[PDB]
């Protein structure tokens, strides 16, 4: 709290002692002009801050004063679209109907005072007032019942903002205890001009995959989910493509998301997430791209995280950071060959009937596999698996015999499994060792900082701890 009596920079002393984003204040209109004026000098009117005010602050006017930052949240009653005549008509009905209920109930006459009270007030005192009958009024499609203190329980609150033209514009409505808003995510527009760096608030795209990133529906106890988890706006393809299609808030967690949550506590980020639309990772076909790689090349999001594989083609168009987890490709079989040179893989012309491969199409390995020797892949064209879980059960039943995919996830699936019946060939044999990292837009200044910070956590012994929680070993 601040003492206006000391109207000098002593207030700025107490005011300077708070560092945070959202500031809430409760003061009068005249003092509001001065306090916001002082903040603009120090810099709290910056682009990163949010001001929240109650109704009484400048609500009952159409001419805004100066020194108020462009962009303000208030919940008021001003009722932009309502009319006084509408309010008066409701008020008149409250008068007549409530008195009608009391008068007709007991033939009650509302005895009036002979004048304004000099002496003749006393005889009307014993007469019962309308309070027992004025608390409850009906009609007009609204429970206009009052209370002891004289405030309604069914009001008409609205939320309103300061637009660019210094003209108040309605945003959302409050009715039947819900927050209906015309805005899904915050607009984040600037303060009063001549101060607008606006170089922050990165957007991030992510895919739902193996334990790197996991998606879940929002818990219905409080329409949110437990702390230590980040919300993310998943798109949908609507119901039967009839119409609409709702951007549904559903928080998501996992490994890759956790690392940036701790990462952005030392680089001061502000972030939002939305998942993918089409495809799984991406492929450069017909000289065009789609996927997260496609998203970044067209500036959909400055950053891009998740399960992303570093490779020759990918680094040609977009830059990559220093990898933090080692991986590659591997093969998984049930319960009889040495590897990429094994003669069994060379030709299916052996005495035994041919066996099959998993080799999920439209991936990263397939493009790499095409590069060295083709004849295996045209064999793989005949039989292509789908998904991940669908592939493993097919191997378990005996529809396939040699599943090929990246090792960083096969070791997990073999670990958290039943009976340890599935293993990888050899002692964790690996081919074409490769790392996983975070890709950023080309030429961005984020390059040096994001690299240095990511390397620092590796030294502090944090990767081991985070690995253990989401990389468990049951068969180990």
């Amino acid at each position, epitope marked *: 709290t601040l003492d206006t009596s000391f109207e000098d920079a002593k207030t700025q002393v107490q005011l300077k002692k708070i560092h945070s984003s959202v500031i809430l204040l409760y003061s009068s209109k005249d003092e509001a002009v001065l306090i916001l004026s002082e903040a603009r000098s120090l810099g709290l009117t910056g682009y990163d801050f949010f001001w929240i005010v109650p109704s009484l602050v400048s609500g009952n006017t159409e001419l805004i004063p100066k020194e108020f930052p462009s962009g303000l949240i208030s919940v008021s009653y001003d009722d932009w679209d309502y009319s006084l005549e509408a309010r008066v008509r409701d008020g008149i009905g409250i008068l007549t109907t409530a008195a009608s209920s009391m008068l007709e109930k007991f033939s009650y006459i509302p005895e009036a005072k002979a004048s304004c009270y000099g002496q003749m007030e006393r005889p009307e005192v014993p007469m019962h007032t309308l309070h027992p009958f004025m608390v409850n009024v009906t009609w007009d499609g609204k429970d206009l019942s009052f209370t002891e203190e004289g405030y309604q329980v069914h009001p008409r609150l609205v939320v309103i903002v300061l637009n660019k033209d210094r003209e108040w514009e309605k945003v959302g409505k409050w009715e039947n205890h819900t927050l209906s808003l015309r805005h899904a995510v915050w607009p984040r527009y600037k303060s009063f001009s001549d101060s607008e760096p*606006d170089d922050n608030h990165l957007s991030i795209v992510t895919l739902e995959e193996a334990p790197f990133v996991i998606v879940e529906d929002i818990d219905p106890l409080t329409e949110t989910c437990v702390r230590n988890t980040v919300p993310c706006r998943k798109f949908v393809k609507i119901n039967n493509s009839t119409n609409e299609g709702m951007n549904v808030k559903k928080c998501c967690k996992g490994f890759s998301i956790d690392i940036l949550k701790k990462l952005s506590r030392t680089v001061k980020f502000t972030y939002d997430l939305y998942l993918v639309t089409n495809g799984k990772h991406g492929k450069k076909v017909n000289n065009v791209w789609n996927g997260m790689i496609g998203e970044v090349v067209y500036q959909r999001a400055v950053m891009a995280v998740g399960s992303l594989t570093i490779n020759e083609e990918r680094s040609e168009v977009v830059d990559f950071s220093v990898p933090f987890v080692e991986t590659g490709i591997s093969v998984m079989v049930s319960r009889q060959v040495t590897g990429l040179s094994d003669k069994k893989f060379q030709r299916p012309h052996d005495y035994s009937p041919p066996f099959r491969f998993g080799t999920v199409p439209n991936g990263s390995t397939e493009r790499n596999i095409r590069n060295n020797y083709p004849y295996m892949h045209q064999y793989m064209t005949k039989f292509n698996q789908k998904g991940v879980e669908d592939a493993l059960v097919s191997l378990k039943t005996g529809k396939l015999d040699a599943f090929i995919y990246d090792a960083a996830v096969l070791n997990y699936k073999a670990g958290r499994d039943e009976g340890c019946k599935l293993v990888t060939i050899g002692s964790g044999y690996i081919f074409a060792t490769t790392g996983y990292g975070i890709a950023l837009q080309k030429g961005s200044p984020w390059k040096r900082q994001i690299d240095l910070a990511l390397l620092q956590f590796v030294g502090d012994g944090e990767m081991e701890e985070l690995e253990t929680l989401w990389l468990t070993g049951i068969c180990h």
Partner: nanobody, 117 residues
Framework: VQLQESGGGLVQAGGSLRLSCAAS????????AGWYRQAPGKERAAAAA???????AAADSVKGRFTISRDNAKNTVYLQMNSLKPEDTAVYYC????????????WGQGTQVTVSS
């Protein structure tokens, strides 16, 4: 939201044009604006983009022929195109995405640009 595209016509090869797409909204600071091209027999293709931060990306296919610009004060994005070639004959479209909303792919009626001798 709704947008509106205009600026087309017939111009000889090597000429120039000024296409424009505009929309109404009080938050116009934060929208990706992109240009799409779709010729007969070919899929829709990206041409030029503008980011929220203020970066410009140009497609390598017809790089250098045109240029993009956005006015923060007035809600309109107009595309300045130069050194026209017959390969550019198509109907250009304007679009936006994100900052709220849903069902995110927004397409105008269309403006046809014709380049010929």
């Amino acid at each position: 939201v709704q947008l509106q595209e205009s600026g087309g016509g017939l111009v000889q090869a090597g000429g120039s044009l000024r296409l424009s797409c505009a929309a109404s909204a009080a938050a116009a600071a934060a929208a990706a604006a992109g240009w799409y091209r779709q010729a007969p027999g070919k899929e829709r293709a990206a041409a030029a983009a503008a980011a929220a931060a203020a970066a410009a990306a140009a497609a390598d296919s017809v790089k250098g022929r045109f240029t993009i610009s956005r006015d923060n004060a007035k809600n309109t994005v107009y595309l300045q195109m130069n050194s026209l070639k017959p390969e550019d004959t198509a109907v250009y479209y304007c679009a936006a995405a994100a900052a709220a909303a849903a069902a995110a792919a927004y397409w105008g009626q269309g403006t046809q640009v014709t380049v010929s001798s």
